Scaffold this active site. Structure first.
Site, short mmCIF file in Angstrom:
data_model
loop_
_atom_site.label_atom_id
_atom_site.label_comp_id
_atom_site.label_asym_id
_atom_site.label_seq_id
_atom_site.Cartn_x
_atom_site.Cartn_y
_atom_site.Cartn_z
N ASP A 110 -4.64 8.36 8.67
CA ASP A 110 -5.40 9.50 9.22
C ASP A 110 -5.75 10.50 8.13
OD1 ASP A 110 -2.88 10.78 9.27
OD2 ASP A 110 -3.23 11.78 11.16
N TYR A 131 -6.01 13.79 5.70
CA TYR A 131 -5.09 14.85 5.26
C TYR A 131 -5.19 16.03 6.20
CZ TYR A 131 -4.75 12.31 0.89
OH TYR A 131 -4.41 11.35 -0.11
N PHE A 184 -7.71 8.54 1.27
CA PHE A 184 -6.99 8.87 0.03
C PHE A 184 -7.52 10.02 -0.80
CE2 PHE A 184 -5.59 4.61 1.22
CZ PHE A 184 -4.24 4.82 1.32
N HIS A 197 2.89 0.25 0.42
CA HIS A 197 2.06 1.46 0.36
C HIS A 197 2.38 2.29 -0.91
CE1 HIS A 197 0.36 5.33 1.70
NE2 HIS A 197 -0.35 4.60 2.54
#
Length: 223
Positions: A63, A65, A76, A185
């Site tokens: 989702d 920031y 990102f 991740h």
């Protein structure tokens, strides 16, 4: 019409469905009543930068920031003037070991988007300060569709799937055509367990070298 023809020709049927109308009413309320990120004009930026025909690599995020001045409607990436999220920083550290690029003095990945890297989050809005606050409100159905239409595309796509949630999408993808680069991740939580050393950029360009396509210049230049 919300998106450019190349995407809108693939996705217009989703935008007509009851679930999207419900989501669209829910977001009209929330943008009016509290602080929602990214800015409403930026919600679909990943698709505005990279058209369906131009997609070369898909990097899936979760989702947006949830802090002020961060999200841009891209996975990102953060805007300029803002410090780098630890997942982004870690991304830059692997990029440095893999390709050699120095770390930038900003965390904006718009250059990647302009070269065909689709920076798609699976959920496209968030309430300030509250992670996963718009989970299960309809975004995940739409972004699954975005993955479906990319899977159906004739020209092969390279999917970068970092972490367990992104890896769950493998079932939607036709791996007889498309290429999968997967690892743990980059989050400081999961990074040291499979992201570092995976060389995800070198490996994508190779998949491009192989199809007769130009590689990505994965290096960002300072402001």
């Amino acid at each position: 019409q919300l998106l450019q023809d190349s995407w809108w020709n693939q996705l217009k049927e989703e935008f007509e469905k009851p679930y999207y109308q419900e989501l669209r009413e829910m977001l009209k309320r929330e943008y009016a009543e509290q602080t929602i990120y990214p800015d409403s004009r930026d919600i679909f930026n990943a698709l505005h930068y990279t058209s369906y025909d131009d997609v070369k690599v898909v990097i899936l995020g979760q989702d947006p920031y949830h802090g002020p001045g961060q999200a841009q409607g891209l996975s990102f990436s953060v805007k300029p003037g803002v410090k780098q999220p630890p997942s982004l920083k870690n991304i830059f550290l692997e990029l440095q070991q893999d390709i050699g690029c120095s770390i930038p003095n900003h965390g904006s990945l718009v250059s990647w988007a302009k070269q065909g890297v689709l920076l798609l989050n699976t959920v496209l809005t968030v309430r300030r300060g509250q992670a996963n606050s718009h989970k299960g409100k309809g975004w995940e159905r739409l972004t699954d569709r975005i993955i479906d239409v990319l899977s159906e595309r004739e020209r092969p796509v390279i999917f970068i799937l970092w972490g367990r949630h992104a890896q769950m999408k493998k079932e939607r993808i036709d791996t007889s055509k498309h290429f999968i680069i997967e690892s743990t991740h980059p989050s400081p939580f999961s990074a040291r367990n499979g992201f570092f050393g995976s060389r995800p950029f070198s490996r994508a360009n190779a998949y491009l070298e192989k199809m007769g396509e130009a590689p990505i210049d994965w290096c960002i230049k300072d402001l």
